[PDB]
Amino acid sequence: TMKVINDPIHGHIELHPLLVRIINTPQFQRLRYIKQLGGGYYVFPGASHNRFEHSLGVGYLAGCLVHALGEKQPELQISERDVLCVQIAGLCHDLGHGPFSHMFDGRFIPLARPEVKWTHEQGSVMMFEHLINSNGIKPVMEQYGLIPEEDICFIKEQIVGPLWPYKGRPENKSFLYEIVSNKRNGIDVDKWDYFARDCHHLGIQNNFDYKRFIKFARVCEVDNELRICARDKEVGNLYDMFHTRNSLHRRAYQHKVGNIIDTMITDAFLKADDYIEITGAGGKKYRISTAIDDMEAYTKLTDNIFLEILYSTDPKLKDAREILKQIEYRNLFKYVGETQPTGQIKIKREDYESLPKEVASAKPKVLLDVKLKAEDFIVDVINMDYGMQEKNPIDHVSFYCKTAPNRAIRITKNQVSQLLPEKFAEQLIRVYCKKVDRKSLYAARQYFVQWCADRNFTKPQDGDVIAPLITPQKKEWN
Amino acid sequence: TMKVINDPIHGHIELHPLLVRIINTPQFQRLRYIKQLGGGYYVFPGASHNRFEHSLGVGYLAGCLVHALGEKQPELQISERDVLCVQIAGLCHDLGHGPFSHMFDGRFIPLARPEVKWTHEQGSVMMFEHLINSNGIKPVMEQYGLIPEEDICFIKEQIVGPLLWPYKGRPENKSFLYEIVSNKRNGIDVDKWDYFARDCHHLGIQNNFDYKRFIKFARVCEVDNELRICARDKEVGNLYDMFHTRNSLHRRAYQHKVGNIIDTMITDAFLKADDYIEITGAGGKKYRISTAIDDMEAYTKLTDNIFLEILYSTDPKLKDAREILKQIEYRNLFKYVGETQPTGQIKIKREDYESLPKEVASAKPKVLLDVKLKAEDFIVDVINMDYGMQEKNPIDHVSFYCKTAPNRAIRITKNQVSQLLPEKFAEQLIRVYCKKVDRKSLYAARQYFVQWCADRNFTKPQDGDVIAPLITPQKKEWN
Amino acid sequence: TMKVINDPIHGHIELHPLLVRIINTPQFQRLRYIKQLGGGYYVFPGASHNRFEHSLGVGYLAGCLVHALGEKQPELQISERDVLCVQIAGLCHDLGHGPFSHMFDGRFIPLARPEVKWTHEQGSVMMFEHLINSNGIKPVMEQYGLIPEEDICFIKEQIVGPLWPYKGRPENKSFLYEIVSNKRNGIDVDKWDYFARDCHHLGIQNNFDYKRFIKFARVCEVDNELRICARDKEVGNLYDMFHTRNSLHRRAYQHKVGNIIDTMITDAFLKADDYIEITGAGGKKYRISTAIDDMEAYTKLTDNIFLEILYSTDPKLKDAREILKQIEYRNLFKYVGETQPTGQIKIKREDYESLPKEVASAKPKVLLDVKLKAEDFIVDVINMDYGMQEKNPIDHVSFYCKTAPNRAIRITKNQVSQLLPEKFAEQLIRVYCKKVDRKSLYAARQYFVQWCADRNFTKPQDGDVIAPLITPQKKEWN
Amino acid sequence: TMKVINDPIHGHIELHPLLVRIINTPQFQRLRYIKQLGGGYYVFPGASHNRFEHSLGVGYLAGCLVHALGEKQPELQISERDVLCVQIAGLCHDLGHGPFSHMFDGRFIPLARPEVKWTHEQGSVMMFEHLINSNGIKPVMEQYGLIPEEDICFIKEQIVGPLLWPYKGRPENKSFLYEIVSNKRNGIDVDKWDYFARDCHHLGIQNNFDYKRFIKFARVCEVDNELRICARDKEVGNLYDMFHTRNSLHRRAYQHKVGNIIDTMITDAFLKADDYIEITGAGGKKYRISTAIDDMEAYTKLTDNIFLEILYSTDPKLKDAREILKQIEYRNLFKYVGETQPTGQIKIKREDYESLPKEVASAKPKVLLDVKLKAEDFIVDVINMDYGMQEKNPIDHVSFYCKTAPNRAIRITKNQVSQLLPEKFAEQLIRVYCKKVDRKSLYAARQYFVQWCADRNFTKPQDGDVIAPLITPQKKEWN
Ligand SMILES: Nc1ncnc2c1ncn2[C@H]1C[C@H](O)[C@@H](COP(=O)(O)NP(=O)(O)OP(=O)(O)O)O1
Ligand SMILES: Nc1ncnc2c1ncn2[C@H]1C[C@H](O)[C@@H](COP(=O)(O)NP(=O)(O)OP(=O)(O)O)O1
Ligand SMILES: Nc1ncnc2c1ncn2[C@H]1C[C@H](O)[C@@H](COP(=O)(O)NP(=O)(O)OP(=O)(O)O)O1
Ligand SMILES: Nc1ncnc2c1ncn2[C@H]1C[C@H](O)[C@@H](COP(=O)(O)NP(=O)(O)OP(=O)(O)O)O1
Ligand SMILES: [Fe+3]
Ligand SMILES: [Fe+3]
Ligand SMILES: [Fe+3]
Ligand SMILES: [Fe+3]
Ligand SMILES: [Mg+2]
Ligand SMILES: [Mg+2]
Ligand SMILES: [Mg+2]
Ligand SMILES: [Mg+2]
Ligand SMILES: [Mg+2]
Ligand SMILES: [Mg+2]
Ligand SMILES: [Mg+2]
Ligand SMILES: [Mg+2]
Ligand SMILES: [Mg+2]
Ligand SMILES: [Mg+2]
C-alpha cells in the first residue's frame, strides 16, 4: 500500500511502494547531504534545504500533472505504467547533483576538467543506472507492470533529453516528455517545486500559482504531435512565471556574495583535488574531479567534503583549509561593482579568461599606493535569460479557447501588453578584488570604473561616489 | 492609555487615545459597510474585506515609517506631534470612498454628474472636516499637544495634495512627511503597502513585495534643496518589482473583465434609481444618490447598503433598477466579446468614450448579417494601465544613496539596471461586451467587434481566428 | 463542464453544474449578506467573512471526504449519485442562518418568540425546499441521475437529523450521514472549514490538520453498521481537535465584548420588531420574528436589517436606533467580571431570568452613592463543552490498527494520557452593567463580588483590586 | 553600523557590530552543522534547519522583549549595556549543543560517560569562554561600553543559571533580566518562542501561540521584594495554551517513536566507533567522541559530520558502527512493539532504566513460545513528558496584573480559570522496540511485551486485543 510522508510545501503525500524502494537506497539518500542553493545558505540563513526534499516534491507534482490530464482526457490512453514512469523520472531527476549543487557543474568541473563536457543531468542518468543495478530494482519494476528495456530508456530521456528522436515512447505520447523537464518551452514541474520550496526557506514570497495552471491545461494536436496547451486567459500568468524566475535569480541565486562564496569554495576544492581520495568500484581511487566517472565513488561525494577539508590536519590540505577558514571569519573577496555591455554587443565565453588582465591594465589618472596584478581581480560573467537564450518562450507555447477546446493557437507578445520586456537575455559583469585592505580596495575601484569607461560599458550605480575623479571622463554619464 | 487591536495582516497594534476618539464616530465606522474591491467579491469570494480594516492598516504603517526615520535620524527633529498628524492622515485617507469604492468615483459620478470634477480624496477631506466638527475632536487634539489651525491643514494636504513651496501645514525642512501617506512625487506610499498585503490575503493570490525591507533601507537626504525619502541603491530592482506587482494585481484582480461588468451593471441600477431614492441630509433636506456628495451628513448614510435597498424594494418606480440587480443574482450578466488595444502612439481620449458603441454597431461586416444590433446593445470599457504617473517612469523620480556616502543622493536610470525592464509605462485595454445574451446575438456581436478592430487598426483579438474566421485573414498586419 | 472558483482557504476548486444552478439563486446568494461571526467583527476587524464562502468550503470538503472513501474502498458502492447528494448537503447546510448567524437563533428568536422551538438547521431544511421549488431545480437533479422523492429526504436528514431512523439511505450507507453534520461524535467537515476560515480572518493560527485525518480514515463494521473510523495513532490529534474548538470559543466566539455587542443588537431588534414589515408570499406582511415562518420573506432578511434601523427616520424606530448609535460611539454596557459555579453544581436554564435580581439584592458592606435595580444588570450564562454535553466524544469514535485494518476498537482516555481534561463541560457566568459612569460601575463591582461570595462561586480574578473591602469576607480566597 | 540579515521566521533583523564579531567565529559558525531536531529529519523531511538560525532568532527575540520593557517603563533604568548583554546571551545560549542536538546530551553522553553529569547548557558556558578568549572579543566589548569582569558573568548566568540573592552579574533591581533567555522560575522564555515558530515552519505543523501578543501585555512588577516580568490577567488562558502547544509538539514531532529510534541507532553507532575515532584538540592531544566535551578546541570540530565520517569510512575497526548506519539508509530499523504507561502515583526511577529489557525478556508467556528472545534484543525507552517543572503547575509560578491597578501583582489559580485544564502536569511514556525484525521474532516480542504490561500493572496497549488476543482477557483491570 501507500506510505504517507509530510512535506511542508505539499502536505501529506502518498508514495507508491516502487517509489519507496528507490528512495531507500544509499544512492537516493545521498541527496540529504547536498544543499539545494549551495553557498546561498551563507547569505540566506533559512536556506538549509537539501535536494532530497526537492526530489520528493518534483516526483509528487509530476504525478499530479499526468493524473489530471488522464482524468479529463481518457482518450489519451495514459496507463498506470505511464504514470509511474513519470513519477520515477520526477523523483530521480536531480540524482546527479554534486556538492553545493550548481557550484559543482557551473564552476568546479569546468575549471578542474576542461577536457570533459559534463552536466548534473548526465550524472542523474548514470546514477539512476547504478541505483537500479546495485539494489535489485528491475524485478520490482516488472512486478508493477513496467517493461525495463523500454521504460528505463523513457525515464532517462525525460531527464536528459533524447523525424521523432525518442526510443521510449511514440509521437502520440509526446506530451509526457513535457512534464519533468520541458525542452520545448521550459514550463515544467521542477520549476514549480523549487519556486515554492526556495521561497518558503529564503524568506521571499512566491507569486506563481501552479495549481491554477494544472486546472486549465489540456492536450491538443499541434504540427501532428500531441502537446500540453493552456487556456488563452493564462497568457499573462505565463509571462509572470518567467518574471518570477528572473526575480529569484536576481535576489537570491546570483546574489553577489552568494556567488563569491561559491567561488571561494571552488578554489578550495581546486587546491585539494590532488590530495583527496575516494574509493570507488573494485577498490580504485578517485579524486573530487574524477569521482564523476565512477558512480560508486560519486555516491560518497557530498557537501561533507567541505568539512573533511576544514577539519583536516594533513599539511597537503593547508592551502584549501586556509580558504575555508577565511569564509568562517567572514574575510571574503571584496565586491567592487557591476556593469553591463551596451549596443547589442556580447561577451564570448573564449574571452572570459582575459578580463582580469584588462582590468589590471586600465591606466586610471594615477593617485595610487599599490599597483594591482591580474591575479588579484575576479570577473564573473552571468548570463540571465528566460531559459531559451534570447528567445521568448511564450512563442513556443500553444493555447486553446473556451469556444474550440481541441484547437491550438498562438498568441504573440503584441496581443498581450506593451509593458512586457523587449529583450529576453542580458549579461551582468561583476568584479571583485582579493586584496581586502582599504588601500587595495580604493585602487580596485579606480581600475574598475576606468575599465567600464574604456569598453563603453554601463556606468556603475555608485560610480560618482566610489570614483569621483573618473566618472567626469565621460560626457555620456552626467 | 493605548488600546490594542488585532489585525490579521499587521498583528497586534497600538492605537493612541486620540485615534480611538476619531475611530469611534459614525463618520469613521461607515467604512465597515463599503467593500474595498466592490464588485470584485462577486468573482473572488474571499474578497469581503471593507475599507475600515484597510484604513487602520494605512494609519499603522504611516506611523511605522515616520518613527523609523525618527530613530535613525534625530537631526530631522520629528516630534510626537508630527507622528500623530501622520497617523491621523493614514487613518482618514479613504473616508470619502462611496459605495463599492472605485465604482463610485470611477463610473457612477462621471455618468450621473458630468458637470462636476470629483474624487474620493476630495470626499475624504470634507468628511474629515465633518467628523472633527460634529464630534468635538478639536479640544482633544489640543489636549495631546496638537495645534488645530496648522495641523488640520497638514492632515488634509497629506491626503489630497496642495490646496516656490505650495504647503501651508509644514515647511520645506519637513517635506519628507508628505511622502508617507500619498506620495505625489513617485507614488511609493504606505497605502499601496497595506492594500498589496491585504488584498492578497483575501483574494488568494500571493504577494511578492516586502515593505519592511524597504523601511530598513530608507533614509532622508537633501535633493534640490528639499529633504526627501531616499532608498539604498541596491533596492532599485525591488522598486521596479513593486510597480510590476501593482500592475499584476490590476490584470488578475481589480480589472477582471467580469468584475468590471458587475461594477457596470451596479452603476446602471444606481442610475435608474437615482430619481426615486431620497437620503436625508443636514437641516432635513433630501438628497439623491448622485447629490449626497454635496452634504456630508447625507453622505455618511451612503454605503453598500443601497444595493440591498434597491434589491429588496417594492416601489413600482424602482422595478427597472431592481430587475438589473436580479439579473446579477441569477448570474445573467452581459457577455464578454473580447479585448483589443490601440497601436503606434495612438491614444483614445476620454471625450470619445461615449461614441464607441455606435462605432461598433456601424461596422459593415462583409455582407453577412441576419439580425442588426443597435448601439444601446454594446458596452465598450476603456482601461488605462500604467505605473501611476501616466507615461513616465516613476523610478526616474526616486533618489538613492550608497553605503560609502550615506548623505548624498543620486539617480539611477533604467539602462544601469537591466535590459529586461518594460520599454513603455502606459497602455490602454479596450473590452467589448454585449447585453443581448442569446447565441444569435452573440455570434453577430463577435463579427461587428472583430471588424471594428480591423477597421481602426487595433490589435488582433486572441481568439480572433476562432470567433471570426471569415474576417481575420482580410488583414495584412495580422498574418 | 466544471466551473472553477478561487477560494483563499481551499484554492482553485471545481463546481459541478448542478451545484452552480443551486448557487445562482436569490436563496443561496443571500448568504453573501450574513457575517459568519456576527458581532465578532466589532472586536476582530479582519472578521468580515460571510456564510456564502463558508458554504462553498463545506460543500467542497464534503466531496473530498466521500471521494476518498470511495477510491480506497470500491466495495462500499459509493455512486456518483451519493457523492452529489453529499456535496449538495454540504453546500446548503447553513441556508437557514439569519442575521448575525448564531445571534439570531441563540439570542433573538428565544427572546422574541418563546412559543416556538427553532434552529438555523430547521431553517436550512425549509429554505432548501423553497429554493428547489421556486427555481426549477428538480428536473436538473434528475438530469444527473438523482431521484427526488428519496434524495431530497437524504439531503435534509444529513443537515438536520432524522432500529434505523432514516428514510433516505439504508444501514449499509450510514457512514454518509457522518460527513456534513456528525451526530455520533461531532467530527465533521463543517468544523474543518470554519476552523481554517475563521483563523485566516481572525488573526489566530490554526493547529488542526484535516488533510491528514482524511488520509487515515476508513469505513469499518461497528455494531452491524458501517462507520467512519480513524487510525489508532490519530487519537492524540482528535483530542487536540476538540481542544482547538474550545480555544476558538474562548478567544473569539465568546469574547466578552463580542457577546455584549450581540446582546445590544438583539435588544435593538426587539425594539423594532413591532414596526418593521417584510413582504412575503401572497403579499402578506411579516416581522423580523415571524419571517422565519415564510421562506419568501426570510429570503430578504439579512444583516442589512441593522443598517435599515440605523439609517431610519421613522419615529417608531428611535428606540432601536439609539441602541445602534450607542454601539457606533462605543458606549457599550460595561463588563463587570466572570465567575463559575463550584462543587459539581449547575445553573438550570429556568433560573436564568432571576439572576439579575439576585445581584441587585446583594447587600455589600455599604459605601454607595447609587443603589442599582435589576433592570441595570445582565447575566450571560455560557455552556462550554466538547459538543456532547458532558460526554467525552472520543468515547464515541472507533479506531483501526495497521495489523487488522477491518476491525474496529475503542481507545479510552487512560490509554492515552494523564494530561487530558478530567471534565468535558463547564459554565461561565458574565455580568455586565448598563449604567456606564464611574460611580455606577464602582458599585456594580461590589454587588457582583458580594454575589459570588454569597453563592459560593469562584473568586473573580481581579477581585482584590476591584473590591478590596469584600474579598476578605472569605477565608477560602487568600 | 548595523548589518541586516533576512530570516524567514522573523524577517529583516539588525545585528549590532559586536554581535557580528561574535557570529563570525569558527565557534559560532559550527552551529551551521548541527540539526535542531536531530533524527527528526529522517521522519519529517522539511526539518533540515540547524542550530545557527535558531540562535540568531533567540538573540533577536531577547532584544525585542528587553527593549519593549524599556520603552514602556523608563523607571527600570535598562541601559544599552543591559540590552546588548541580553542579546549576546540569546545568541550564544545553545553554543554547547553537540551532534544531533538533544540526542547528544539526552542519550550518548549518559551511556558513554556515566561518571559525569553534563548538559548542553554547561557546554555553552565553556564554548562561550573559548570563543571570547580565542578571538579577541574582550576589547571589542569595552569598545561598546561593556565591562567584561561583570558582563561575562552576567551572560553566563542567563544561559546556565546561578554559578539570599545568588547572582554576581546583576543585583535584585535587575532580576527581570534573567527571565528573558532561560526562565528558571516558570519556563516562559524567548527560546521557546523561537523554536515553536521555527520548528512549525519546517515540520509542516502549524503553531497556535502568539508571542507578540504576550509582549504587548507584559510588565515588570514588584513581587516578594524582587522585580519580575508579569502578564495581564486576561492572558492566563493563553499561557495554559502555550504549555499545551509545547506538549503537542513533543507528541507529534520531537518524541515520534521512529524519530527516537533513529536517535537510538545513531547513538549505538557512535558507541561502537568511540574507541577508534580521534579528534585533535588543544596542544595536539587526541580526544574521542565521548571526551571531546572536555576540550573546547576539539569540541569545535565535533558536529553532525561525524555520522558521515563513519558511514564513508573503510577502516575495518569501524565496520560495526558503519553497518548500523547502513541499516538506517536501507530503512531496516528496529521495530516498534508498542507503548504503555505506569499507574496510580507509581514512577520509574532513572537508575532502573537499564534493567527493563531483562524484565521484558523474562516475561513468562502462558506456555506458548517456539523461540526465546534475549535482553540484548529489546529496547525500552522511558520518556518524561511534563510542563517543564516536573510535577508542578508553572502557571502557579506566574504573576499577573489588572487594568485598574497596573503596578500590583496577583496570582490566579487553576480553578479560577477552567474545569477543562489538566488534572496532572507530568507523566511517563514507555516504548518497546525489537532489534530482530522477522515475523516470528516480532510476534513473540508482542507477547513478552503485553505480558510485561499485565505483570507490572501498566496501561493496556491500544492495539493489545489485536497483537495479543490470548493475553488481554486475563486482566480484570482491562475488561
Ligand atoms: N500528529 C502529526 N501531525 C502532523 N504530522 C505528523 C504527525 N505525526 C506524524 N507526522 C508526520 C511525520 C511523517 O513525515 C508522516 C508520517 O508519520 P506517521 O503518520 O507517524 N507514520 P509511521 O510510519 O510512524 O506509522 P505507521 O507505520 O504506524 O503508519 O507524518
Ligand atoms: N486570545 C487572543 N488571541 C488573539 N487575539 C485576541 C485574543 N483575545 C482577544 N483578541 C483580539 C481582539 C481584539 O482585536 C484585540 C484585543 O482584545 P482583548 O485583548 O480581548 N482587549 P479588551 O479591550 O477586550 O480588554 P481590556 O479592555 O480589559 O484590555 O485582540
Ligand atoms: N490570474 C489569476 N490568478 C489567480 N486567480 C485568478 C486569476 N484570474 C482569475 N482568478 C480567479 C477569479 C475566480 O475566483 C476564478 C475563476 O476566474 P477566471 O479564471 O477568470 N474564469 P472566468 O469565468 O472569468 O473565464 P471563462 O468563463 O472564460 O473560463 O479565478
Ligand atoms: N531583494 C531581496 N529581498 C529579500 N531579501 C534579500 C534581498 N536581497 C538580499 N536579501 C537578503 C540576504 C541577506 O539575508 C539580507 C541582506 O542582503 P543585502 O541586502 O543583499 N546586503 P549585503 O551585505 O549583500 O550588501 P551591502 O553590504 O552593500 O549592504 O537580505
Ligand atoms: Fe530539480
Ligand atoms: Fe487607500
Ligand atoms: Fe456551517
Ligand atoms: Fe535553544
Ligand atoms: Mg536538475
Ligand atoms: Mg529545467
Ligand atoms: Mg477594552
Ligand atoms: Mg485613496
Ligand atoms: Mg495612491
Ligand atoms: Mg450550521
Ligand atoms: Mg455541528
Ligand atoms: Mg554587506
Ligand atoms: Mg538550550
Ligand atoms: Mg528551556
Author numbering:
A (entry chain A), C (entry chain A): 114 to 275, 284 to 599
B (entry chain B), D (entry chain B): 114 to 276, 284 to 599
The authors write:
Sterile alpha motif and HD domain-containing protein 1 (SAMHD1) is an important regulator of cellular 2′-deoxynucleoside-5′-triphosphate (dNTP) in mammalian cells. Although the HD-domain contains the active site, dNTP hydrolysis requires assembly of SAMHD1 into homo-tetramers. Here, sequences at the N and C termini of the HD-domain stabilise inter-monomer protein–protein interactions and incorporate four pairs of allosteric nucleotide-binding sites, AL1 and AL2, which regulate the enzyme through combined binding of G-based (AL1) and 2′-deoxynucleoside (AL2) triphosphates. Using combined biophysical and X-ray structural studies incorporating nucleotide analogues along with mutagenesis experiments we have now discovered that SAMHD1 uses a bi-metallic Fe–Mg centre to catalyse dNTP hydrolysis in a reaction similar to those catalysed by HD domains in both human and bacterial phosphodiesterase PDE enzymes.
Co-crystal structures were determined using either wild-type (wt) wt-SAMHD1(109-626) or a D137N-SAMHD1(109-626) AL1 allosteric site mutant that generally produced higher resolution diffraction than wt co-crystals. A further effect of the D137N substitution is that D137N-SAMHD1 is activated by xanthosine-5′-triphosphate (XTP) rather than GTP through AL1-binding but nevertheless maintains comparable catalytic parameters for dNTP hydrolysis as those observed for wt-SAMHD1 and GTP. We first determined structures of two co-complexes of D137N-SAMHD1(109-626) in the presence of Mg2+, which is required for tetramer assembly and catalysis, with (i) XTP (AL1) and dAMPNPP (AL2 and active site), and (ii) XTP (AL1) and dGMPNPP (AL2 and active site). However, with regards to the active-site nucleotide configuration and metal ion content, it is apparent there are significant differences that are crucial for understanding the catalytic mechanism of SAMHD1. This is most evident in our highest resolution structure, D137N-SAMHD1(109-626)-XTP-dAMPNPP-Mg, that clearly demonstrates how three octahedrally coordinated metal ions Fe, Mg2 and Mg3, support catalysis through interactions with the bound substrate, as detailed below. Inspection of the D137N-XTP-dAMPNPP structure reveals the key residues that position the α-phosphate proximal to the HD motif-coordinated iron, and are likely important for dNTP hydrolysis. In particular, the nucleotide 5′ oxygen, as well as non-bridging α-phosphate oxygens of dAMPNPP make hydrogen bonds with SAMHD1 side chains Arg164, His210 and His215, whereas the β- and γ-phosphates are coordinated by Mg2. The two non-bridging α-phosphate oxygens form coordinate bonds with Fe and Mg3, one phosphate oxygen coordinates Fe with an Fe–O bond distance of 2.2 Å and the second phosphate oxygen coordinates Mg3, with an Mg–O bond distance of 2.3 Å.
